[PDB]
Write a protein that holds these residues in place. Structure first.
Motif, PDB file in Angstrom:
ATOM      1  N   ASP A  85      58.770  -4.452  11.034  1.00  0.00           N
ATOM      2  CA  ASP A  85      58.097  -5.699  10.682  1.00  0.00           C
ATOM      3  C   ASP A  85      57.956  -6.643  11.874  1.00  0.00           C
ATOM      4  OD1 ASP A  85      59.059  -6.127   7.190  1.00  0.00           O
ATOM      5  OD2 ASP A  85      58.880  -4.310   8.409  1.00  0.00           O
ATOM      6  N   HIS A  86      57.844  -6.078  13.071  1.00  0.00           N
ATOM      7  CA  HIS A  86      57.709  -6.884  14.280  1.00  0.00           C
ATOM      8  C   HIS A  86      56.253  -6.941  14.740  1.00  0.00           C
ATOM      9  CE1 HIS A  86      58.439  -8.444  18.342  1.00  0.00           C
ATOM     10  NE2 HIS A  86      59.630  -8.812  17.903  1.00  0.00           N
ATOM     11  N   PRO A  87      55.765  -8.151  15.059  1.00  0.00           N
ATOM     12  CA  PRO A  87      54.375  -8.407  15.459  1.00  0.00           C
ATOM     13  C   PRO A  87      53.934  -7.608  16.686  1.00  0.00           C
ATOM     14  CG  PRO A  87      55.482 -10.458  14.939  1.00  0.00           C
ATOM     15  CD  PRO A  87      56.542  -9.398  14.949  1.00  0.00           C
ATOM     16  N   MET A  88      54.882  -7.272  17.557  1.00  0.00           N
ATOM     17  CA  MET A  88      54.587  -6.534  18.783  1.00  0.00           C
ATOM     18  C   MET A  88      53.970  -5.167  18.494  1.00  0.00           C
ATOM     19  SD  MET A  88      54.579  -7.026  21.926  1.00  0.00           S
ATOM     20  CE  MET A  88      54.174  -6.047  23.356  1.00  0.00           C
ATOM     21  N   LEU A  89      54.309  -4.607  17.337  1.00  0.00           N
ATOM     22  CA  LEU A  89      53.771  -3.325  16.906  1.00  0.00           C
ATOM     23  C   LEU A  89      52.257  -3.390  16.716  1.00  0.00           C
ATOM     24  CD1 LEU A  89      56.538  -2.187  14.386  1.00  0.00           C
ATOM     25  CD2 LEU A  89      56.150  -1.378  16.713  1.00  0.00           C
ATOM     26  N   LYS A  90      51.742  -4.593  16.483  1.00  0.00           N
ATOM     27  CA  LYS A  90      50.301  -4.791  16.358  1.00  0.00           C
ATOM     28  C   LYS A  90      49.672  -5.170  17.698  1.00  0.00           C
ATOM     29  CE  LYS A  90      49.575  -5.792  11.461  1.00  0.00           C
ATOM     30  NZ  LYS A  90      50.733  -4.944  11.059  1.00  0.00           N
ATOM     31  N   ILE A  91      50.510  -5.328  18.716  1.00  0.00           N
ATOM     32  CA  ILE A  91      50.038  -5.653  20.058  1.00  0.00           C
ATOM     33  C   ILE A  91      50.208  -4.461  20.992  1.00  0.00           C
ATOM     34  CG2 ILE A  91      50.377  -7.106  22.091  1.00  0.00           C
ATOM     35  CD1 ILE A  91      51.177  -9.370  20.337  1.00  0.00           C
ATOM     36  N   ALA A  92      51.384  -3.842  20.934  1.00  0.00           N
ATOM     37  CA  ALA A  92      51.709  -2.714  21.799  1.00  0.00           C
ATOM     38  C   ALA A  92      51.095  -1.408  21.302  1.00  0.00           C
ATOM     39  CB  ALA A  92      53.219  -2.571  21.939  1.00  0.00           C
ATOM     40  N   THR A  93      49.770  -1.326  21.348  1.00  0.00           N
ATOM     41  CA  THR A  93      49.074  -0.102  20.978  1.00  0.00           C
ATOM     42  C   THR A  93      47.833   0.076  21.844  1.00  0.00           C
ATOM     43  OG1 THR A  93      48.069   1.161  19.161  1.00  0.00           O
ATOM     44  CG2 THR A  93      47.708  -1.222  19.182  1.00  0.00           C
ATOM     45  N   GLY A  94      47.357   1.312  21.943  1.00  0.00           N
ATOM     46  CA  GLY A  94      46.194   1.610  22.756  1.00  0.00           C
ATOM     47  C   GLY A  94      44.908   1.153  22.101  1.00  0.00           C
ATOM     48  N   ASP A  95      43.891   0.894  22.918  1.00  0.00           N
ATOM     49  CA  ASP A  95      42.592   0.486  22.401  1.00  0.00           C
ATOM     50  C   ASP A  95      41.925   1.656  21.689  1.00  0.00           C
ATOM     51  OD1 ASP A  95      40.146   1.504  24.416  1.00  0.00           O
ATOM     52  OD2 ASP A  95      42.111   1.374  25.386  1.00  0.00           O
ATOM     53  N   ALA A  96      41.096   1.343  20.699  1.00  0.00           N
ATOM     54  CA  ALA A  96      40.508   2.353  19.821  1.00  0.00           C
ATOM     55  C   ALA A  96      39.673   3.400  20.556  1.00  0.00           C
ATOM     56  CB  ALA A  96      39.682   1.685  18.729  1.00  0.00           C
ATOM     57  N   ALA A  97      39.041   2.994  21.653  1.00  0.00           N
ATOM     58  CA  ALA A  97      38.192   3.897  22.425  1.00  0.00           C
ATOM     59  C   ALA A  97      38.988   5.067  22.993  1.00  0.00           C
ATOM     60  CB  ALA A  97      37.488   3.139  23.541  1.00  0.00           C
ATOM     61  N   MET A  98      40.242   4.804  23.348  1.00  0.00           N
ATOM     62  CA  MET A  98      41.120   5.828  23.899  1.00  0.00           C
ATOM     63  C   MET A  98      41.419   6.902  22.857  1.00  0.00           C
ATOM     64  SD  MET A  98      44.681   5.233  25.988  1.00  0.00           S
ATOM     65  CE  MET A  98      45.570   4.726  24.519  1.00  0.00           C
ATOM     66  N   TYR A  99      41.787   6.462  21.656  1.00  0.00           N
ATOM     67  CA  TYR A  99      42.092   7.379  20.564  1.00  0.00           C
ATOM     68  C   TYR A  99      40.858   8.149  20.104  1.00  0.00           C
ATOM     69  CZ  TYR A  99      46.560   4.922  20.248  1.00  0.00           C
ATOM     70  OH  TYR A  99      47.792   4.377  20.525  1.00  0.00           O
ATOM     71  N   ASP A 100      39.726   7.456  20.008  1.00  0.00           N
ATOM     72  CA  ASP A 100      38.476   8.097  19.613  1.00  0.00           C
ATOM     73  C   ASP A 100      38.065   9.153  20.632  1.00  0.00           C
ATOM     74  OD1 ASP A 100      38.387   6.506  17.364  1.00  0.00           O
ATOM     75  OD2 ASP A 100      37.007   5.038  18.238  1.00  0.00           O
ATOM     76  N   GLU A 101      38.209   8.819  21.911  1.00  0.00           N
ATOM     77  CA  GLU A 101      37.909   9.757  22.986  1.00  0.00           C
ATOM     78  C   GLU A 101      38.831  10.969  22.925  1.00  0.00           C
ATOM     79  OE1 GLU A 101      35.441   9.832  24.981  1.00  0.00           O
ATOM     80  OE2 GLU A 101      36.064  11.505  26.257  1.00  0.00           O
ATOM     81  N   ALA A 102      40.116  10.722  22.684  1.00  0.00           N
ATOM     82  CA  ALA A 102      41.092  11.803  22.563  1.00  0.00           C
ATOM     83  C   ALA A 102      40.730  12.746  21.417  1.00  0.00           C
ATOM     84  CB  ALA A 102      42.488  11.237  22.366  1.00  0.00           C
ATOM     85  N   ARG A 103      40.355  12.163  20.283  1.00  0.00           N
ATOM     86  CA  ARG A 103      39.939  12.931  19.116  1.00  0.00           C
ATOM     87  C   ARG A 103      38.705  13.767  19.440  1.00  0.00           C
ATOM     88  NH1 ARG A 103      38.827   9.488  13.799  1.00  0.00           N
ATOM     89  NH2 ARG A 103      40.430   8.347  14.980  1.00  0.00           N
ATOM     90  N   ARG A 104      37.749  13.148  20.128  1.00  0.00           N
ATOM     91  CA  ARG A 104      36.523  13.824  20.542  1.00  0.00           C
ATOM     92  C   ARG A 104      36.833  15.033  21.419  1.00  0.00           C
ATOM     93  NH1 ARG A 104      35.208  13.487  24.875  1.00  0.00           N
ATOM     94  NH2 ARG A 104      33.569  14.861  25.705  1.00  0.00           N
ATOM     95  N   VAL A 105      37.741  14.841  22.372  1.00  0.00           N
ATOM     96  CA  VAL A 105      38.156  15.914  23.273  1.00  0.00           C
ATOM     97  C   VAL A 105      38.830  17.045  22.501  1.00  0.00           C
ATOM     98  CG1 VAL A 105      39.645  16.561  25.193  1.00  0.00           C
ATOM     99  CG2 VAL A 105      38.393  14.405  25.274  1.00  0.00           C
ATOM    100  N   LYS A 106      39.715  16.679  21.578  1.00  0.00           N
ATOM    101  CA  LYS A 106      40.409  17.659  20.746  1.00  0.00           C
ATOM    102  C   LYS A 106      39.416  18.517  19.963  1.00  0.00           C
ATOM    103  CE  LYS A 106      42.706  16.106  17.266  1.00  0.00           C
ATOM    104  NZ  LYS A 106      42.658  15.724  15.827  1.00  0.00           N
ATOM    105  N   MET A 107      38.524  17.848  19.238  1.00  0.00           N
ATOM    106  CA  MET A 107      37.500  18.525  18.447  1.00  0.00           C
ATOM    107  C   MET A 107      36.617  19.416  19.314  1.00  0.00           C
ATOM    108  SD  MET A 107      36.450  15.397  15.904  1.00  0.00           S
ATOM    109  CE  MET A 107      34.827  16.119  15.667  1.00  0.00           C
ATOM    110  N   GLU A 108      36.276  18.926  20.502  1.00  0.00           N
ATOM    111  CA  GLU A 108      35.469  19.689  21.449  1.00  0.00           C
ATOM    112  C   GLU A 108      36.176  20.977  21.864  1.00  0.00           C
ATOM    113  OE1 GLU A 108      34.938  18.930  26.010  1.00  0.00           O
ATOM    114  OE2 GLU A 108      33.319  17.856  24.987  1.00  0.00           O
TER     115      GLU A 108
END
Length: 319
Positions: A85-108
């Motif tokens: 329940d700590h607010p940092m968990l909503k701050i300390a995360t990667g930007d969505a483009a990184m995850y989407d790109e990773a997913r794209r690479v995986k699927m590829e």
DNA sequence: CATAATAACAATATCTTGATATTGTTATTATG
């Protein structure tokens, strides 16, 4: 929302590193430790954002996958120290483009693999060697052989597997055992977390059960049993890598080098070739014998990397 | 010089749709 807390495991891995004979300095765990330390007493969300911006600024030139893994480490540390329940968990995360790109690479990558299957010419010899490993006295070998015959992950096999006889009417099944200790479930609601389900084996059940009994009752077997992921990764991983490298050097497909997890892939393949009923899909069967999430058929896509030489022949015969 | 030990670095495959938990590979340390 506590303001206080300490990532115990990280600091433990730090203090257990000061009197090392050799090896790298735990710089990343230091980064994380100083991070969690700096987080103590913080209620300024902007300063939290600045701290994470510093930490992110540090990871530069590193692979995207690496950055993602590191972020996972950081988030788990924050959860360990302060809680969920700590607010940092909503701050300390990667930007969505990184995850989407990773997913794209995986699927590829998966798509490319499905587009170019690898013919496992000498798979019978691999299963044979893996069968011979079940009669070895070396716990490592027995473990490898159990990976080969049961198709369980190295972590599952060495650390937390629970193999037991599977009933076949009144008697005991020959080509199937019961398995408990599924990994990577993340305690999912529709996963095999703590669920004993029936899996097929590539040799007679008695041999597998006996070999596993010789595995658990060994010294290294009881050293392995109940370990964490990092303990096993630091204890057996490289040795297992070398041993597997040597065991299947000249019989493994020329395209790739023999990796342990491959034994799982292959397993599924032949497990589909000799046991699969006609009223199910290959995806469904893979997802069934691998212990995947409920109604999930997409994870099975990652295991279809090989093709048996017999099927290859029966497909070449199309003239 | 020099090879063994360690954690960084990295990628995969799972539960879930943004991430985690695994498996896999390499640069760096002390040291002797």
């Amino acid at each position: 929302y506590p303001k206080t807390g300490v990532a115990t495991s990280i600091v433990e891995k730090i203090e257990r590193a000061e009197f090392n004979t050799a090896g790298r300095k735990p710089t990343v765990l230091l980064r994380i430790a100083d991070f969690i330390a700096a987080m103590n007493g913080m209620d300024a969300k902007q300063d939290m954002q600045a701290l994470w911006d510093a930490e992110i600024a540090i990871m530069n030139g590193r692979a995207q996958t690496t950055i993602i893994s590191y972020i996972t480490k950081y988030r788990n540390a924050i959860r360990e120290a302060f809680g969920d329940d700590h607010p940092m968990l909503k701050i300390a995360t990667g930007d969505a483009a990184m995850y989407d790109e990773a997913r794209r690479v995986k699927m590829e990558k998966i798509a490319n693999k499905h587009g170019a299957l690898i013919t496992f010419e000498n798979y019978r010899q691999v299963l044979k060697i893996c069968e011979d490993c079940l009669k070895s006295s070396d716990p490592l070998m027995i473990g490898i052989g159990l990976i080969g015959m049961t198709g369980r992950a190295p972590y599952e096999v060495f650390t937390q597997a629970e193999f037991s006889p599977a009933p076949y009417g009144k008697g005991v099944s020959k080509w199937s055992i019961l398995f408990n200790g599924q990994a990577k479930t993340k305690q999912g609601e529709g996963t095999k977390f703590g669920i004993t389900y029936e899996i097929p084996v590539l040799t007679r059940s008695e041999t597998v059960l006996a070999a596993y009994k010789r595995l658990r009752e060994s010294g290294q077997g009881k050293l392995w049993h109940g370990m964490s992921i990092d303990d096993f990764s630091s204890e057996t991983r490289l040795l297992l890598r070398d041993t597997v490298f040597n065991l299947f050097e000249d019989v493994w497909p020329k395209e790739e080098l023999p990796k342990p997890y491959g034994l799982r892939h292959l397993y599924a393949e032949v497990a589909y070739h000799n046991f699969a009923p006609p009223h199910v899909t290959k995806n469904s069967y893979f997802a069934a014998i691998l212990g995947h999430n409920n109604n999930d058929l997409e994870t099975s896509l990652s295991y279809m990397t090989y093709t048996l030489p017999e099927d290859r022949d029966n497909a070449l015969a199309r003239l």
